Design a protein around this ligand. Sequence first.
Ligand SMILES: N[C@@H](CCSC(F)(F)F)C(=O)O
Ligand SMILES: [Co+2]
Ligand SMILES: [Co+2]
Ligand code: NA
Length: 262
Amino acid sequence: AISIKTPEDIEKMRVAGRLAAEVLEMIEPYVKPGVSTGELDRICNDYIVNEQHAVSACLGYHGYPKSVCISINEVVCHGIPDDAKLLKDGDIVNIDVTVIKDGFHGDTSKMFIVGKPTIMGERLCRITQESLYLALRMVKPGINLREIGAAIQKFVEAEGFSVVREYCGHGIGQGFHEEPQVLHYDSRETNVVLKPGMTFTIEPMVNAGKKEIRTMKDGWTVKTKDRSLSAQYEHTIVVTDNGCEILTLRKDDTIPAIISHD
Ligand SMILES: N[C@@H](CCSC(F)(F)F)C(=O)O
Ligand SMILES: [Co+2]
Ligand SMILES: [Co+2]
Ligand code: NA
């Protein structure tokens, strides 16, 4: 049951996508050594609710307790904001935001480097964003999703890193996680042909070390098994007649919002 968005639907996604992107743009100046993730979460929440007049899709979802997910270093995803977790020089941190506006969702994330970067950290973040961009450039009607997953994997592994298998991109719209599942690796199981009007996310999680992950006892936090650094970037897109449009593009993205093939 893959939903195809109408033009009106697409209009609302553009708004939701822009709101989400804006939370990430807004938070940047607050990301510095000595700030806690709990504080970042509060600032985000206040902005979403009080300024944007929107709502966080994460709060209460399956019982999730906070408004955004903040994942530091070896935390792969779903890191839970906490007043006790302070950022230090060299940390790499993912902030994943999902906002709801007029019933439509906007889902996006980026990595931030705290204070003075480490060589590994900078490199990992770069490669991960590039793997996302590569995928975006391939999106167009008629192509099989499998090709995209395969390309990401090949790229990442060629750079000496690994791709997380367990978590993947997903359709999105009135629902947070809709069909289809967007795998970030090559799999004979994948068989989905793209068509215009489809909206989904691409959000590869890449590990500096081995691919294996582990879910923590808190039941949310996921970390790499070998404790290596992990990075992720995410954008929400719409498949167009000749390519794609990135709904959550920010001022710092270096890819064009509309990608055209011909
Ligand atoms: N924004 C995340 C999901 C966060 S829901 C939570 F339960 F894990 F917070 C995504 O891209 O799927
Ligand atoms: Co997300
Ligand atoms: Co997502
Ligand atoms: Na991380």
